[PDB]
A paper describes a structure:
The crystal structure of PaeDAH7PSPA1901 (phzC) was solved (resolution 2.70 Å, Rfree = 0.280) in complex with the substrate PEP and a Co2+ ion, with attached water molecule, bound at the active site, revealing for the first time the structure of a short-form type II DAH7PS that is involved in secondary (here phenazine) metabolism. PaeDAH7PSPA1901 crystallised in the space group C2221, with two DAH7PS chains present in the asymmetric unit. As with all DAH7PS structures reported to date, PaeDAH7PSPA1901 features a core (β/α)8-barrel fold, with an N-terminal extension to the core catalytic domain consistent with its membership of the type II DAH7PS family. Residues 1–59 form an N-terminal extension to the barrel, providing additional helices α0a, α0b and α0c, with strong structural homology to the equivalent helices in other structurally characterised type II DAH7PSs, in particular PaeDAH7PSPA2843. Residues 167–181 form loop α2β3, which lacks the inserted helices α2a and α2b as observed in both MtuDAH7PS and PaeDAH7PSPA2843. The PEP phosphate group is co-ordinated by atoms Glu217_N, Arg218_NH1, Arg271_NE, Arg271_NH2 and Lys240_NZ whereas the carboxylate group of PEP is co-ordinated by atoms Arg106_NH1 and Lys240_NZ. Unexpectedly, despite the absence of the α2a and α2b helices in PaeDAH7PSPA1901, which are associated with the formation of the minor interface in either PaeDAH7PSPA2843 or MtuDAH7PS, an alternative interaction to deliver a homotetrameric species is observed in PaeDAH7PSPA1901. This alternative minor interface for PaeDAH7PSPA1901 is formed through interaction between chains A and D (or chains B and C) by residues located primarily on loop α3β4 and is distinctive from the minor interface observed for all characterised DAH7PSs (both type I and II). For PaeDAH7PSPA1901, the alternative oligomeric interfaces and subsequent formation of a significantly different quaternary assembly, relative to either PaeDAH7PSPA2843 or MtuDAH7PS, disrupts completely the formation of any aromatic amino acid allosteric binding sites that are comparable with those observed for either PaeDAH7PSPA2843 or MtuDAHPS.
PhzC encodes a putative 3-deoxy-d-arabino-heptulosonate 7-phosphate (DAH7P) synthase (DAH7PS), which catalyses the aldol-like condensation reaction between phosphoenolpyruvate (PEP) and erythrose 4-phosphate (E4P) to form DAH7P as the first committed step of the shikimate pathway, en route to chorismate. Although less than 10% sequence identity exists between the type I and II DAH7PS groupings, all characterised examples of DAH7PSs share a common (β/α)8-barrel fold, a common divalent metal-ion binding site and conservation of almost all of the residues involved with E4P and PEP binding. In comparison, P. aeruginosa expresses two type Iα and two type II DAH7PSs. The type II DAH7PSs are encoded by the ORFs PA1901 (and duplicated as PA4212) and PA2843 (PaeDAH7PSPA1901 and PaeDAH7PSPA2843 respectively).
Numbering used by the authors:
A (entry chain A): 1 to 119, 124 to 172, 178 to 389
B (entry chain B): 1 to 121, 124 to 170, 178 to 389
């Protein structure tokens, strides 16, 4: 509505950029507010019903794409390649998990990243293509809200290429981290019954560092038609998580809430099961996906951070044991990947030396399709 | 039409079963003649145009399924798993080949197999020739040829077509070896312009041992709307192949003819290129697929004949070099596969006694999905 904006704008907002010109933002937000939504409420409903099936344990989920999307990579060929990666993993998971697989993308809006510390020589950290320039500088890192406008345009293109231009396939659903508010608040819409929905993406999640119960991001998604998701990390409280679930799934609707566990290969086995049982006890028909990526980030001797593939697979296996054991629906995988033949991730600790070459990520290390294949295989 | 039947029944017919009861056949053929076709002529035309694209080099093909389809495997779950295998390989090929991939199945009619030796090794029962002809069992009664089986095959095929989505996308096209004339002749149909088509399958091929130019099977497919294909083996003559092409692609239509090279890992490199160049010279816009299975069959001390995965991959690589070198369109792969986690094929010579466990194939050894994955990878 506009009610919702008011409510959300009177909460605390984390990881929000300092936009240079207040006027330009007002202009941008106006333009976005008066533009077509990227997705449709009927499709949202469609997906929502599918995720109800996933909560009943009769279907599985593969979510995959870049850490930080490149918004010159909005062209037919390259999105085709990303969709092919999804084909590959979907088929693999179907065979490993013996259930139907829903394809979901980290695409058409992954243009913002949250930062642990805001601040080379004490410069401002890179925030994504929707916020600031890639190269480390003074002026480039200056936040430019026109980038949001460019991001919208690229996202529209990607949606067209994906097949959400007209009504018809076996669809590729769209998801990205709903961290930003100026963009996202401008993308709110109402349906035929005045029920509000987020119009930027089918299936948004909230990042680990913006999931405060009394916070803005939760408030937004709390009152939104879209199926919602939330990242969950090792050092979250039982009581915390319960409150979070009450706000995002008050009616205990199966398919509504999705919790993506990212707590690392070692910690997951000890941390996850108490959380899962409490949510089961609370009566939330939640669906758990594993995020074995962000739990297991590791610094290589040369090159950036990487992740050992063995570690990722370990976590996937442990995740399923934990969730299934404690009585929850273990429903699939959340991975960051790429079609490009990169070496950003390596099989194991021995391989650490060859990280450097073929490393193209704007942010976190991604899995090459075949590495991701290994990760999905662990599911059994 | 019916004149076609006359013509085709005039020619020489190989690998045709000795049906026990003649009258029952007449009844069966009548019933089939008066039953709905499994596929439709508009879909055929759809596919035909797609294969024109494949002949221009703007798309690729994955054909895969069982050597000998099991008739009681006609249920939603199991065909879902087969389609998932196709998802997996299609995605893989798309990534390796950097072009759009067409999914085609060895399904809904692969119920007959051609045999070199009518009998086998106490008894000496006649060899089992597919679930549409003979019992799997090793006695004398089951091996008795029963034409009711054709009727059962039709029924199972109808079910599979429904589950595949042709009852009313990212379509799974259907193919099988056009072999049982009694069945197949009964499945001939006419469209709105009285153009005849084979109504059992979208995309039929003829096996290497029934591809005689002046033979029955060629004659049938010669005058049929469906896109047609033909297996091509090591010892085929230049002149032979040319004549074959003239009969199956008289008007030089791109997308019409498909030649599936199955020659073996060693022989393919030397034998294929002269054939490919001659057809190029003849001006036939043909599309070549590799069949690295049938060229490379090997006996196992422990079990029934297997295939080394390394050999299969070798042939795939060699196939592409040969075809691309000599100026023809190398357009994809033809593989006998299964979703089941079997050991019917082994990586290489090292796996001596592993073939013991998990060997369920009615006929020739199949690839497990992951082994097939390796085979598709060789395309690179
Ligand atoms: Cl059924
Ligand atoms: Co990331
Ligand atoms: Co075979």
């Amino acid at each position: 509505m506009d009610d919702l904006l008011q409510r959300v704008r009177r909460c605390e907002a984390l990881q929000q950029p300092e936009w240079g010109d207040p006027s330009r933002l007002r202009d941008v937000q106006a333009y976005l507010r008066g533009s077509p939504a990227l997705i449709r409420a009927g499709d949202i409903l469609a997906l929502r019903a599918t995720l109800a099936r996933v909560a009943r344990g009769e279907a599985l989920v593969v979510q995959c794409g870049d850490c930080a999307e490149d918004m010159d990579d909005h062209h037919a060929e390259n999105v085709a390649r990303k969709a092919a990666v999804l084909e590959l993993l979907a088929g693999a998971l179907r065979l490993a998990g013996r259930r139907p697989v829903i394809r979901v993308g980290r695409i058409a809006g992954q243009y913002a990243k949250p930062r642990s510390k805001p601040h080379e020589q004490t410069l401002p950290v890179y925030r994504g293509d929707m916020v600031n320039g890639r190269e480390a500088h003074a002026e480039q890192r200056r936040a430019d809200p026109q980038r949001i406008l460019k991001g919208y345009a690229a996202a529209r293109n990607i949606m067209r290429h994906l097949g959400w231009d007209a009504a018809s396939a076996s669809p590729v659903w769209t998801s990205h981290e709903m961290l930003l508010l100026d963009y996202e608040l401008s993308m709110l819409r109402e349906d035929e019954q005045r029920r509000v929905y987020l119009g930027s993406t089918h299936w948004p999640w909230i990042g680990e560092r913006t999931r405060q119960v009394d916070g803005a991001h939760v408030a937004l998604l709390a009152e939104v038609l879209n199926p919602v998701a939330c990242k969950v990390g090792p050092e979250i409280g039982r009581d915390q998580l319960l409150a979070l679930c009450e706000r995002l799934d008050p009616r205990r609707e199966p398919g509504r809430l999705t919790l993506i566990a990212r707590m690392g290969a070692q910690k997951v086995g000890e941390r996850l099961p108490p959380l899962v049982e409490a949510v089961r006890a609370a009566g939330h028909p939640v669906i758990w996906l594993s995020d074995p990526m962000h739990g297991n980030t590791i610094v290589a001797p040369c090159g950036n951070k990487t992740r050992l593939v063995r570690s990722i697979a370990e976590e996937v296996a442990a995740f399923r044991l934990a969730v299934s054991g404690s009585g929850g629906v273990a429903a699939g995988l959340h991975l960051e990947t790429t079609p490009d033949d990169v070496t950003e991730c390596v099989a194991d600790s021995s391989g650490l030396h060859q990280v450097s070459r073929h490393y193209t990520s704007l942010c976190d290390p991604r899995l090459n399709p075949w590495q991701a294949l290994s990760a999905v295989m662990a599911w059994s």
